[PDB]
Design an enzyme around this catalytic site. Sequence first.
Site, PDB file in Angstrom:
ATOM      1  N   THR B 138      64.815   5.776 101.241  1.00 30.43           N
ATOM      2  CA  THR B 138      64.076   4.698 100.606  1.00 30.43           C
ATOM      3  C   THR B 138      64.512   3.297 101.034  1.00 30.43           C
ATOM      4  OG1 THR B 138      63.685   6.078  98.644  1.00 30.43           O
ATOM      5  CG2 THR B 138      63.375   3.702  98.392  1.00 30.43           C
ATOM      6  N   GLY B 177      71.983   7.126  96.302  1.00 28.75           N
ATOM      7  CA  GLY B 177      73.182   7.346  95.514  1.00 28.75           C
ATOM      8  C   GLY B 177      74.387   7.519  96.418  1.00 28.75           C
ATOM      9  N   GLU B 402      61.580  11.934  93.974  1.00 28.32           N
ATOM     10  CA  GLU B 402      61.203  13.254  94.475  1.00 28.32           C
ATOM     11  C   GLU B 402      59.689  13.404  94.345  1.00 28.32           C
ATOM     12  OE1 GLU B 402      63.485  14.467  96.241  1.00 28.32           O
ATOM     13  OE2 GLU B 402      64.927  15.679  95.135  1.00 28.32           O
TER      14      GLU B 402
HETATM   15  C1  LIG Z   1      67.824   6.210  89.514  1.00 26.05           C
HETATM   16  C2  LIG Z   1      67.143   6.391  90.851  1.00 26.05           C
HETATM   17  C3  LIG Z   1      67.827   6.997  91.888  1.00 26.05           C
HETATM   18  C4  LIG Z   1      67.257   7.101  93.186  1.00 26.05           C
HETATM   19  N1  LIG Z   1      68.010   7.724  94.156  1.00 26.05           N
HETATM   20  C5  LIG Z   1      67.544   7.712  95.428  1.00 26.05           C
HETATM   21  C6  LIG Z   1      68.344   8.292  96.494  1.00 26.05           C
HETATM   22  O1  LIG Z   1      69.350   8.934  96.293  1.00 26.05           O
HETATM   23  N2  LIG Z   1      67.904   8.090  97.791  1.00 26.05           N
HETATM   24  C7  LIG Z   1      66.622   7.502  98.059  1.00 26.05           C
HETATM   25  O2  LIG Z   1      66.349   7.321  99.202  1.00 26.05           O
HETATM   26  N3  LIG Z   1      65.785   7.172  97.071  1.00 26.05           N
HETATM   27  C8  LIG Z   1      66.235   7.136  95.778  1.00 26.05           C
HETATM   28  N4  LIG Z   1      65.483   6.552  94.802  1.00 26.05           N
HETATM   29  C9  LIG Z   1      64.187   5.888  95.142  1.00 26.05           C
HETATM   30  C10 LIG Z   1      62.984   6.894  95.111  1.00 26.05           C
HETATM   31  O3  LIG Z   1      63.067   7.634  96.311  1.00 26.05           O
HETATM   32  C11 LIG Z   1      61.697   6.077  95.063  1.00 26.05           C
HETATM   33  O4  LIG Z   1      61.704   5.378  93.827  1.00 26.05           O
HETATM   34  C12 LIG Z   1      60.429   6.978  95.112  1.00 26.05           C
HETATM   35  O5  LIG Z   1      60.456   7.851  96.265  1.00 26.05           O
HETATM   36  C13 LIG Z   1      59.167   6.100  95.179  1.00 26.05           C
HETATM   37  O6  LIG Z   1      59.383   4.798  94.297  1.00 26.05           O
HETATM   38  P1  LIG Z   1      58.720   3.495  94.628  1.00 26.05           P
HETATM   39  O7  LIG Z   1      59.108   2.461  93.800  1.00 26.05           O
HETATM   40  O8  LIG Z   1      59.057   3.286  96.123  1.00 26.05           O
HETATM   41  O9  LIG Z   1      57.296   3.655  94.396  1.00 26.05           O
HETATM   42  P2  LIG Z   1      55.966   2.880  94.731  1.00 26.05           P
HETATM   43  O10 LIG Z   1      54.954   3.866  95.154  1.00 26.05           O
HETATM   44  O11 LIG Z   1      56.134   1.726  95.424  1.00 26.05           O
HETATM   45  O12 LIG Z   1      55.359   2.495  93.389  1.00 26.05           O
HETATM   46  C14 LIG Z   1      55.069   3.465  92.354  1.00 26.05           C
HETATM   47  C15 LIG Z   1      53.749   3.027  91.680  1.00 26.05           C
HETATM   48  O13 LIG Z   1      52.686   2.952  92.726  1.00 26.05           O
HETATM   49  C16 LIG Z   1      51.703   4.022  92.413  1.00 26.05           C
HETATM   50  N5  LIG Z   1      51.284   4.574  93.703  1.00 26.05           N
HETATM   51  C17 LIG Z   1      51.995   4.612  94.883  1.00 26.05           C
HETATM   52  N6  LIG Z   1      51.324   5.204  95.869  1.00 26.05           N
HETATM   53  C18 LIG Z   1      50.125   5.573  95.308  1.00 26.05           C
HETATM   54  C19 LIG Z   1      48.954   6.270  95.860  1.00 26.05           C
HETATM   55  N7  LIG Z   1      48.864   6.692  97.098  1.00 26.05           N
HETATM   56  N8  LIG Z   1      47.914   6.459  94.960  1.00 26.05           N
HETATM   57  C20 LIG Z   1      47.965   6.038  93.661  1.00 26.05           C
HETATM   58  N9  LIG Z   1      48.996   5.400  93.079  1.00 26.05           N
HETATM   59  C21 LIG Z   1      50.056   5.188  93.943  1.00 26.05           C
HETATM   60  C22 LIG Z   1      52.500   4.988  91.583  1.00 26.05           C
HETATM   61  O14 LIG Z   1      51.687   5.921  90.934  1.00 26.05           O
HETATM   62  C23 LIG Z   1      53.231   4.050  90.661  1.00 26.05           C
HETATM   63  O15 LIG Z   1      52.555   3.573  89.549  1.00 26.05           O
HETATM   64  C24 LIG Z   1      65.940   6.549  93.422  1.00 26.05           C
HETATM   65  C25 LIG Z   1      65.182   6.030  92.348  1.00 26.05           C
HETATM   66  C26 LIG Z   1      65.760   5.928  91.058  1.00 26.05           C
HETATM   67  C27 LIG Z   1      64.924   5.342  89.939  1.00 26.05           C
HETATM   68  C1  LIG Z   2      67.547  15.419  90.571  1.00 23.53           C
HETATM   69  C2  LIG Z   2      68.489  16.054  91.598  1.00 23.53           C
HETATM   70  C3  LIG Z   2      67.972  15.779  93.009  1.00 23.53           C
HETATM   71  C4  LIG Z   2      69.110  15.515  94.001  1.00 23.53           C
HETATM   72  C5  LIG Z   2      69.845  14.199  93.728  1.00 23.53           C
HETATM   73  C6  LIG Z   2      69.177  12.938  94.289  1.00 23.53           C
HETATM   74  C7  LIG Z   2      67.955  12.433  93.517  1.00 23.53           C
HETATM   75  C8  LIG Z   2      67.158  11.406  94.328  1.00 23.53           C
HETATM   76  C9  LIG Z   2      66.633  12.024  95.632  1.00 23.53           C
HETATM   77  C10 LIG Z   2      65.564  11.237  96.392  1.00 23.53           C
HETATM   78  O1  LIG Z   2      65.530  11.704  97.747  1.00 23.53           O
HETATM   79  C11 LIG Z   2      64.202  11.483  95.738  1.00 23.53           C
HETATM   80  C12 LIG Z   2      63.051  10.939  96.585  1.00 23.53           C
HETATM   81  O2  LIG Z   2      62.897  11.436  97.722  1.00 23.53           O
HETATM   82  O3  LIG Z   2      62.352  10.035  96.081  1.00 23.53           O
END
Ligand SMILES: Cc1cc2nc3c(=O)[nH]c(=O)nc-3n(C[C@H](O)[C@H](O)[C@H](O)COP(=O)(O)OP(=O)(O)OC[C@H]3O[C@@H](n4cnc5c(N)ncnc54)[C@H](O)[C@@H]3O)c2cc1C
Ligand SMILES: CCCCCCCCC[C@@H](O)CC(=O)O
Lengths: 622, 622
Positions: B138, B177, B402
Amino acid sequence: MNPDLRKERASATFNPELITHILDGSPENTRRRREIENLILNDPDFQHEDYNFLTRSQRYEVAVKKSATMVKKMREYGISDPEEIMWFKNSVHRGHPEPLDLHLGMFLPTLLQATAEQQERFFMPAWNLEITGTYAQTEMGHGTHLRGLETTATYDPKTQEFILNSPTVTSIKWWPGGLGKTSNHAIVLAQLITQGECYGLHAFVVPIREIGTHKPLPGITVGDIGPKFGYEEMDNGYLKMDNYRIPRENMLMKYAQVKPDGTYVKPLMVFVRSFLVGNAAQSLSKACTIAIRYSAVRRQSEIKQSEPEPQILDFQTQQYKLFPLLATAYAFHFVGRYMKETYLRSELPELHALTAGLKAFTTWTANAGIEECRMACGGHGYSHSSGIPNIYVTFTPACTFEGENTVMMLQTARFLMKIYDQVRSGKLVGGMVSYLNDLPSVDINSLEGLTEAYKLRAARLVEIAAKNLQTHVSHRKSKEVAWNLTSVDLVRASEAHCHYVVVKVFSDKLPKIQDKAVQAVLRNLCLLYSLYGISQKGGDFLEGSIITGAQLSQVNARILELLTLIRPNAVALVDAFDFKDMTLGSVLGRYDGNVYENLFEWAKKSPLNKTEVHESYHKHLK
Amino acid sequence: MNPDLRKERASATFNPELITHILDGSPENTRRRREIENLILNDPDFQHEDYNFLTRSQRYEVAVKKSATMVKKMREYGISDPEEIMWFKNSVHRGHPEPLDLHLGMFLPTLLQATAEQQERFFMPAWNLEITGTYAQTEMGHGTHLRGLETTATYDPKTQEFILNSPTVTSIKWWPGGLGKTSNHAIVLAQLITQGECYGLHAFVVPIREIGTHKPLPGITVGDIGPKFGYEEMDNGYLKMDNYRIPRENMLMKYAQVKPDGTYVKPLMVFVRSFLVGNAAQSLSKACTIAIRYSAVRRQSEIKQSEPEPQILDFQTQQYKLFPLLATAYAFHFVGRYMKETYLRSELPELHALTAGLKAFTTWTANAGIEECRMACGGHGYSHSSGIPNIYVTFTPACTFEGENTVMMLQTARFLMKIYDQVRSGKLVGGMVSYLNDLPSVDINSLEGLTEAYKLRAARLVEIAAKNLQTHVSHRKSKEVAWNLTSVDLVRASEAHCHYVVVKVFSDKLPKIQDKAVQAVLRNLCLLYSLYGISQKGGDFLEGSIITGAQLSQVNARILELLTLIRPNAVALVDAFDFKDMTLGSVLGRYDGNVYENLFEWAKKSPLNKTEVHESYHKHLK
Ligand SMILES: Cc1cc2nc3c(=O)[nH]c(=O)nc-3n(C[C@H](O)[C@H](O)[C@H](O)COP(=O)(O)OP(=O)(O)OC[C@H]3O[C@@H](n4cnc5c(N)ncnc54)[C@H](O)[C@@H]3O)c2cc1C
Ligand SMILES: CCCCCCCCC[C@@H](O)CC(=O)O
Ligand SMILES: Cc1cc2nc3c(=O)[nH]c(=O)nc-3n(C[C@H](O)[C@H](O)[C@H](O)COP(=O)(O)OP(=O)(O)OC[C@H]3O[C@@H](n4cnc5c(N)ncnc54)[C@H](O)[C@@H]3O)c2cc1C
Ligand SMILES: CCCCCCCCC[C@@H](O)CC(=O)O
């Protein structure tokens, strides 16, 4: 300004400033509020590090610091208007709870159920902060059922004193804001016992900490109740009294008294609820402001593969998540105003009943709605940088205190069953329950038709609740047992009644809107709120033959059409709330839309980045 | 043991131990889990102060400490079974997130998409913790749309190195993380560019901190992303690379490669989702355990005025708040198992589609359900002593990561429309979508009839979504625009399909239950879950002529009857989850029911009570 946020504001069909005037009650109120906000914003005495960057202890401390300064300045500035006082306090605390909340909201006011002598003995000192006070009602074992409170106040005729005592662990006062570490005085609600008889709950001024040292007085055990979901800056506390003595003259005796010889004598809310409805509207609006602005800035995924990633606000699902909540926010703002209006004007039972119900109805909806806003922001919504987690955590207790919501809905239900029984007996009732005269028990195109649908739905669920309650009374005899066995149906009836009231109040307000462009947009929100409620509970309207299945599908289609019609005004509609950036406490929801650069900085300014290497590395990884 | 909790356990009609065996998969698994839990519980190396009593920095630290020790001991104990590893980790961290999560869950595993040479060069060191790693996918500007990731990896043929670069603020990796302060290595997903052409996302092992000093290497800017709603002990981080060079051999080349001369070559999830469904079931069950036990201990208000305050569990509204969620918890446990089972056994598209949908369906329901449990506990639910706020905060990100839930539901919808089109063309489909063969488009008394109702409701909403989508394609031509305009209907169709699957899977499991008393109680939960879903969305079933208004009222009446029938088993049903007190992290939900005494102590042990007088008193009040 972010070009994406600028284009949204350019597409608006109305002047948000006009809505701000309506929300404040007048153009002069808007001016006065903005000026008071500016007064605090540029005052160094009220500035400090981001609350999220401070430990809980430091949050409580800065809170105490600002609250003490707050009282001093309002006094220096001669601010006495309750409305200005609110604006002032809100600005100073950026929406966060503060430790002098009960001191100013209950302690001082209550001293104004006191006698003169007392008033001139505890007020002035408390007013000048020479004394800090709170109000201790709730006990570990009782919050809802006050009759069950265990704290006792036993009169001692030999020394003319009251003996305050916490006989059990459950009797310990629990939750009172400012009780933990802030106040040296507390007005304690206790069961008054004198001459071998108990006379119920009465109020007593109880000194609890020594002046100068703030040390707990002998027989007093007091402290903070520990960390909570939120309320970091509030020292919610506990208070245990070991047969602690106070003068007889410490009993608030305006209404009832106790003579020197121990003789007991005499005697010879809607406001806090109205405020909670406004609080629900405001918190939901803050949440909506953040999510909608962010949605206009956030570009992700795609619609047409050949097109660049669109603003997520372009997605119908995103609009469906937020616009209905935006409409709900406005609906509640007007509902709150209706309440204040009605209260300022035989209609009391009706008032208490409706106010109990609306308080529960709005706080529950705003509660869920705030979290929907947070999640609609995706991952960044989870960070405190979105500002929404603090808004939710700070707001959510509203569903629990000042009358637990389920209990409040049942109070509203008792009123509805009373009116139902009156009509059943042959009496003609008035007020918002007039529809009950039409028992036993439209146009989806107009607000008049939609209001009528909500009216009939309420009549239908009230009838169902009454019928089921009656069935239980008939077979089981005990009305108390019967009430419990139909309580789920009763709460549903209260919910339907309140929903109808919100729809009606929102609808009734439209014709009064002066500016046409403003009326038109707010009409779309009212329509969305109404149709949305029907779609969400379609079964209620179909079961009662209120609308056909065909109309329900039309309702759903119309909701989607309204989303696109509202889209062009989405951002301007939240700008209208006029929340300052400091008030939203959100990087994602900033007025200028410059999110990403500010998010990176925010993160770099955070605590764990104080050093490049965390101490834990040297101790457990190296 | 609290007498109130003892009487509830005495009224149980089944042996909870038997349910525990089912949940663990076998009596031996239960035995093995309990023994591993005991192994950790009595180990001084894993004990410490309550997380809620520590600052975020200290939480991260104790987390790092326990995680490092965790790896060492599992290795010393020879624990290799993935299942035991999970139990072990859960016990050590008391349910809280931990910084080596990606190191163990992604870093090491991925090295197993690597070549041999690489594996023997980064694995062993990482396995022994000589190196600490994470996976950075991400970016601040992209989470859902991976194609939009901006990080680039440009090959330099002159030095045979890849140049990793974060060209913009949005390109900065964000959220990973263990990336913040824990790891000195990160596998970075970047757009591979070589010979003037981009070949998409590829993985690169990127050293980021110096060995020994843990200092950020030249060209590396890394740190924590700041405080969040939860995840205090997780150093979610950001990573900015300034044209940072790494060897060509650092590119994971199992599938695709890049030759020394720069030539690009070749190439020649359901699991994490299944786990998230289990996580949703488990978190909701923890929440239910706490609220139901507390409800059995908490006495308040009254039913019969002449009777003492009853356990709040006696209130129909309280039962209505919790039992349906208790049933949901069990339904999800079996749904999760069904997933693992199915996955362990041309059906792939179907698998991916359903798993995406169930992940969203369960996490959303568990999410709301957890907060309902918290609020049902009244005021004390708000304190961290209830343990629920931590459970909610820790769980809620599951709806976002995920695969964002709405996006996942749309993926499920794409599959359903595909199947719809196949049937429309004349093809006979199989799997859980067989019902689509019955297009175009019961007995409320039996589970077979209820399952059929859910099947027909799903068929009806799928048809509605397909019809509306078609209407939009016909009038607007672009299928991409059409898809967006019917996206709200599509997600509803996916939701209905998944709901049907949960009901069917739960129903299908009952006949397999060996012990009769166990089958009977779980049948009541299955019935409650099914009927409850119908009542909550009655409009769906009525609009489709699936059930009559009369049956809907019967459904509602039957739900209330089931609550009283379930009541006697409520507490035993949560005991069956076998959560240890340390795992619930709740004073209100303690197994022994001794709430109040322990709550008072908990509060007195909290941080602000370190001293009787807070420092802020001397500085701003004295
Ligand atoms: C506590 C926590 C831990 C995390 N840990 C990790 C990690 O270990 N490594 C990592 O890489 N990532 C991690 N993440 C990030 C996570 O991967 C992303 O949050 C997720 O994959 C997508 O979030 P976003 O904000 O980028 O979503 P975005 O899509 O930007 O925004 C979400 C909003 O847009 C809407 N939306 C998006 N696309 C569409 C579509 N095509 N059609 C309709 N609606 C749509 C959704 O429905 C929603 O309302 C973590 C997130 C949290 C909260
Ligand atoms: C809940 C347990 C999953 C493994 C730990 C890491 C959780 C965040 C993973 C991130 O890759 C999810 C995503 O791809 O948006
Ligand atoms: C952050 C915060 C700050 C607070 N600040 C203060 C303060 O300043 N001073 C103060 O004195 N108090 C304060 N309180 C406590 C508050 O007054 C109590 O929480 C509230 O009045 C009742 O909560 P309870 O837990 O005692 O509820 P309880 O009633 O014990 O439990 C609530 C649960 O029981 C159910 N229930 C209870 N009675 C009935 C009934 N008759 N029928 C059906 N269901 C029923 C409810 O619906 C709910 O599910 C605060 C609370 C919070 C969370
Ligand atoms: C929301 C603002 C209300 C005034 C501040 C104190 C809030 C808690 C008050 C407590 O008395 C509510 C209750 O009686 O349960």
